[PDB]
Amino acid sequence: EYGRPFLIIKDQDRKSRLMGLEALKSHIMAAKAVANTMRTSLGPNGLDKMMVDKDGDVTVTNDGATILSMMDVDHQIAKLMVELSKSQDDEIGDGTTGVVVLAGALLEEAEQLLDRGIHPIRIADGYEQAARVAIEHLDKISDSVLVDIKDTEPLIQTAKTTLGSKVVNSCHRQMAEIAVNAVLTVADMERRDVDFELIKVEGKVGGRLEDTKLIKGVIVDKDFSHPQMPKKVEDAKIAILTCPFEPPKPKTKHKLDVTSVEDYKALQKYEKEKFEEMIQQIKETGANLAICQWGFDDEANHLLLQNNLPAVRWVGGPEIELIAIATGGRIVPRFSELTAEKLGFAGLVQEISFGTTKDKMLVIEQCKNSRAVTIFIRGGNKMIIEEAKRSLHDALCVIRNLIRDNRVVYGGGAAEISCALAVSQEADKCPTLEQYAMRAFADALEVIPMALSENSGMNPIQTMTEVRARQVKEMNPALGIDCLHKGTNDMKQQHVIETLIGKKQQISLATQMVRMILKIDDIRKPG
Amino acid sequence: TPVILLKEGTDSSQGIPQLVSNISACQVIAEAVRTTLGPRGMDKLIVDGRGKATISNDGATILKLLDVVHPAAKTLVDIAKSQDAEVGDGTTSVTLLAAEFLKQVKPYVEEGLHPQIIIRAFRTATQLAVNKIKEIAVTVKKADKVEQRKLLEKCAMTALSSKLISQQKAFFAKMVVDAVMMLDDLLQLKMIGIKKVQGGALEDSQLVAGVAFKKTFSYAGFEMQPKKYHNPKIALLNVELELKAEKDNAEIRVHTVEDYQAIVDAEWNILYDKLEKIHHSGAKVVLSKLPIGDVATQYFADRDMFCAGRVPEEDLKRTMMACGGSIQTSVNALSADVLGRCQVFEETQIGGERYNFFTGCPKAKTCTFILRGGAEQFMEETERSLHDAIMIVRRAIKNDSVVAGGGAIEMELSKYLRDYSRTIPGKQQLLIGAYAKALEIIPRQLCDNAGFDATNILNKLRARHAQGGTWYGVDINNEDIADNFEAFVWEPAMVRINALTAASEAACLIVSVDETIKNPR
């Protein structure tokens, strides 16, 4: 019959394939490469990465999620790790590099068991069992503390711990205070949620980083329309409008026919009567400042200047709603609907001018109890501003997590060491060949102290051996790696605090991703 | 030779060689999905031209993703698609059975045997096997209202054993059973929503008896209105609420400025009339398929009412079915009977997104799944796994006849056909024996995937099934055989009834082809 080369698949001669253990080994190598790249940016002593864009733009960052997002890869496993980091960032907002490090360590540990002749489904089941045991152990050692506006000290400590790893650590006390104050101002407590559209983060290059501050009001990049208007008002009553200061115009197609000189003069009179009428309508309500979403005409501008009432032109919708929420006023669509009950009170409206440029900005401040605040970031470099924004976002996310759930554990590797001890203790009672997988999980759960010690410059095996011996001898699960060399291993005394849901998310997400990676056994792709 | 019959480029092949080639190609096609069967089956990764990857364990999905252009091989894809459309489960087994039939009857074809005898033997064997399955199936006439639930749960758990969510099968089976029992009499699939929100763990997946959908585009003022109601009234509309021209066909001709001003005022009067007509009905939540303007948003926010626009048609239909209203294109007859009612409405943060939840309606005829996970393909495979259980539960609700799995039914059918074959003489005996031998590919593949000694286990299964243990199959964890009916490995009889008919029909069609002719381009 001569079964000569017969064509089954389209483009058969230009596609490749990989089967068996070779595909699994390639996946493990890719995961190890990604984890080893991400290892060095862990801890208060970690370094950061410089990423060059497709167009030549520079980003200096320490955030694992941003680094993995800005890297471009071909390997499907690498893309899976990127998506894992992004999912962690979306859910929790912190600990996006520890999860990828843990996943890489776990996949690396599975390799010896694969070589010894163990079905990968058995490895996945053992990993599931160990993860469940570790998670059950984790909530047993957690301590709940507090959420209130009166104390704020544990929240400040948590924010300090989360900001300790960034370039902002020069003023991390100040920025932690800013973050906790903003979240407590914006937060809704009966429903236990916050909205990040009520926090506006803006930054302008120049000045000093320490000039960063919090404004319980609004700051916008606009100015007063007429150059001869006053630059400050101290008891401002704000009328917020969404209609242009122009004569009205129906939306449907229309034609106004002029057939006589009398009609011409009637139209001429009507045009200016409208301009006068709108200004008298605005003035009759007692307002002192007007804000509009659209433009003015020259006549309206001069009338506004003449009647001693400054105005702001060409603002945006989000800015208008933020201003209304801050000042307690309401947005009105017509001048006919303007009443003194719809104005907003602001204790100060000012125009701030920066250095030798012409750039000017408007600040609204000193309102009564407000649900909107802004963060004003300053710095000497654009990348400084960007990294400050990212660090502040991390702090806000952590404080939000504390609002959602208010029980914590202690960092520096203490939780990982305790979980590894618990898993190793439990594995001694499992006879059904799964003890190997459980001990592999226990070994891979101890990569965080290795990374921390190696970054800090000490000896990993000796350090963690001594720490684990101390933990098992005494009864303090709050002992970790002394990264900053203060002379103690007690993180409870050193005030190193981490949220519980962060650790739970890391462990569960990493375990499930590792299971997915292990399950695959074939790959097909073009050349 | 001077003038040729057909156009140049035509290719033809006839006789035994092309039949053997077709049999050979079907073997490759079956080898493509061989290792994805059983509780210890792996999955495959396919990368397309655009770089988009797909990770799958579903036989039909894998076969569709493969770019098969062989005319004989396309039949095995077609039967898999047919099985998926008809019963929704069993896509790999039918392909394996078809390939096994062809491989078993290859040598007799090579000996010069006439294919129609083979076709007749296949048809006889298929009819006998289907009749025997229908005879030995197990059913309960009047079991219970609660013994009608454990059957569905067992079927779903068996269907979920070989998938990515195998560890949480007890968690997911309950939800799928609830979803199906909360669904009408037509059991429409579109009345079940599936949403995928990144972040969180698999155990965080949830089922809402009610409705929930993603936040849509919002204008200025949307943040100034409340976001939680206890006993609201819901208006569902197909009307556009914003200031606009009445008709694109219109035109206004006017002479005086007073009439100009009246014309300007008329549009605001019209819009405010519609808004007041909506407001005076008592509704607290407003949903529309058409854009909701900023003026309308601020109007609603100034009176503590919630508005949403550009809601998808499917979501709006599901909301109407859950609450009990009706879509209105006119606000001139907003009575009470056209307003929906729910026991609580909220907006919540889920994994970086904002979702609207309507929960508490007891008269609901629908439900919604919220699925969590770590990746897009993770969630896609979760949804694919859920679909398999949903279809199986629907079929089981239709008819409640089940048989044990793990190879017990195939062993019984093989034993029956082997016993029958000894009665008849001639080449029919040989062909029926080959058909009976072809049926035990499923236990062999199960043991091969699990990593057992398949020969010894098959010998033990054969020895047990003949001594008299109708429901005996392989035990994956115990390395041995076990009664699969007392171990709760169940599946409806349709999966095997449809698999046999589909596989037998594809085998006959391929054998009955004599020559293949290809036209240019």
Ligand SMILES: Nc1ncnc2c1ncn2[C@@H]1O[C@H](COP(=O)(O)OP(=O)(O)O)[C@@H](O)[C@H]1O
């Ligand atoms: N002052 C500190 N002492 C000891 N360990 C610390 C300290 N600050 C942070 N760490 C540890 O560094 C680890 C990595 O945190 P970080 O480098 O900020 O990135 P990520 O939080 O995304 O993992 C955390 O697990 C934390 O326990």
Ligand SMILES: Nc1ncnc2c1ncn2[C@@H]1O[C@H](COP(=O)(O)OP(=O)(O)O)[C@@H](O)[C@H]1O
């Ligand atoms: N717990 C179990 N023990 C033994 N066999 C099982 C078990 N669960 C499923 N099976 C077998 O696996 C087969 C189902 O294969 P699967 O890969 O799920 O997709 P398909 O149904 O399309 O073949 C069935 O023949 C069934 O007998």
Ligand SMILES: [Mg+2]
């Ligand atoms: Mg961090």
Ligand SMILES: [Mg+2]
């Ligand atoms: Mg199946």
